[PDB]
Symmetry: C2
């Protein structure tokens, strides 16, 4: 298969151990998220530094981001946001969310800034609708917030050769100079000096991402050393597989999909097992919070006591509930609720300003 332990050894990452989990549960006074307990988020760099930092200072922040997509977001895009929701609540720390509308403009030849803004505003609604805590969240668009990032971006630029940018990101000489210099803007928010309205300088940053992003993220950590700032901490997730195989539109669950569209996609296109190869069981590892129910389902399926139609039906109900709750939350959002996410001066955020 994928062999993630081989990939850890290759990249030089570290496994998240049982003791890391115990330590998280202890520091947050709460059970660890199922993504961590089930090995969905499975590796890290410098997690001990972060846990020890939080233990002594009760302080860090979480950085994540989103390039605005041309199509509707699908379930795979929300996975990291569900994890950030958990992190912000369990640790009680700020979450900053970059919308890289500039990146989308620079990388898509026929897209205008105006059109990209319509996509950005829709994505923001989906992001908020996972149930993020408004009081501990700061969302920003790069087009609007660049002035706060720029002094940091300059320092990152100065320490990144063209060779390094091209080698790391696979750019070529026909690529526009926006693409070439964009990565600094994605690195910058790892450094708390980019958020002077509510963070102190040089506060550690936790950045959840896919294991596949580690080679790119190494540039952030190398740059931090040259800037004499903390290296951003990373926890890595496995690839969430498409419906058709664990290794087009019928390969994902869009958040705008109806109950009937979800039913058909799972029944017709989701691969059936063998727990390791059954896509429905795999998705239940992400979506089912109750450990006992998951193990009971896994027990019955492997023994043959549960058929494929039944495990697919359980997934469809779970998915349908999730998607309908999401659609319901999104529909209820007011412009005032949305704007509040973009406010850097919230008193709950400003608590961390002198920590």
């Amino acid at each position: 298969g994928i062999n993630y332990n081989k990939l850890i050894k290759e990249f030089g990452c570290s496994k998240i151990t049982e003791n890391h989990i115990k330590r998280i549960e202890k520091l947050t006074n709460s059970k660890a998220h199922h993504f961590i307990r089930r090995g969905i988020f499975f590796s890290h760099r410098d997690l001990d530094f972060l846990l020890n930092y939080y233990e002594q200072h009760k302080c860090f922040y979480i950085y994540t981001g989103r390039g605005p997509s041309s199509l509707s977001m699908h379930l795979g895009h929300l996975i990291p946001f569900y994890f950030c929701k958990y992190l912000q609540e369990a640790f009680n720390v700020p979450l900053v969310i970059q919308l890289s509308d500039d990146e989308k403009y620079l990388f898509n030849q026929n897209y205008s800034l105006e059109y990209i803004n319509t996509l950005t505003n829709e994505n923001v609604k989906d992001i908020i609708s996972v149930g993020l805590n408004p009081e501990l969240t700061f969302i920003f668009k790069n087009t609007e917030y660049a002035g706060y990032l720029y002094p940091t971006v300059l320092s990152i630029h100065k320490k990144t050769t063209l060779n390094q940018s091209m080698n790391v990101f696979g750019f070529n000489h026909s690529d526009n100079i926006g693409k070439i210099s964009y990565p600094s803007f994605q690195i910058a928010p790892c450094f708390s000096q980019c958020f002077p309205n509510f963070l102190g300088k040089n506060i550690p940053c936790l950045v959840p991402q896919g294991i596949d992003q580690d080679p790119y993220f190494r540039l952030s950590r190398d740059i931090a050393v040259k800037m004499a700032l903390h290296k951003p901490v990373v926890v890595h997730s496995v690839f969430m597989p498409g419906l058709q195989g664990v290794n087009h539109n019928n390969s994902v669950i869009f958040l705008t999909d109806t109950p009937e569209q979800i039913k058909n996609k799972i029944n017709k296109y989701a691969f059936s097992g063998n727990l390791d190869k059954d896509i429905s069981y795999q998705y239940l590892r992400y979506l089912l919070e109750d450990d006992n129910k998951l193990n009971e389902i896994g027990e019955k399926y492997k023994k043959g006591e549960m058929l494929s139609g039944e495990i697919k039906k359980i997934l469809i109900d779970v998915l349908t509930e999730l998607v309908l709750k999401h659609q319901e939350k999104k529909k209820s959002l007011t412009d005032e609720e949305i704007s509040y996410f973009f406010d850097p001066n919230k008193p709950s955020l400003q608590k961390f300003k002198n920590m």
Copy 2:
């Protein structure tokens, strides 16, 4: 020396004609600046587009800029600012001034932002001290104003391949990506959409430049076409020569007049180091007369002496041999000394409040152009 008409034909610029000058005097209800009348600013691209636009709408703006220098500014650095002072007053339009502190940080490996800010603040004081009108001036640091430039910068970036940037500016693969992408930030202020606090969209921009900068400025005009925005208008100046030779441009502190120089330092530099177009003996000078094209003092008086009659009278007497080198050098020293002392006095009097006002984009006097 430098054949400027040949250089016009080579670059594809246009001469500023006597009729352009008449048209400027008519539109401003005032005599044209001596730099224009004496051919110091001598060529242009799209000046008629600008004059026609002003005639109908009474509106454009002026863009200039300054990379913060490691040393004190000298007289040559102020020349374009004296011209922008005239333009803003005669036309009654805004002047925006870019301080490219970001550029200096990106291109000088051992300079910090903090150190560059010290240089920037001192340069700003020298710029203001030419007598710029606070009400029609907007100064900005790129480090502070980048957020307003960024959407425009993105569009410029998107229209510029890495190949094009590297070929045009001579970058290599060891250059940092800040250098590679910086030129867009220098182009951006040619487009009025960068100043939404006080300018309408797609308002024409006038950019005074040395003739030597035209090849680089063509990139701004080409980008404007791809953005479907007005091309920035340019008026070009001749090279201002250093003290030692008309063919050579600005130990080597004796080739320029620093703005921190004392009256005595100026006296000595002119007397000892300024090139004379006069005869080597008094008798030789009386018989053969002085050479105006090569006398540095006469050339500098072309920049500094506002009264035409006095300049022509001085030029008449020197060329005939009726005025000696010592006398024309003395006239220049008095003129320079007065200029530099006024400057030093103005700079010393500047308050933090006066300086801050230059950086305010919401001045009611600037905002009058917002719907024009």
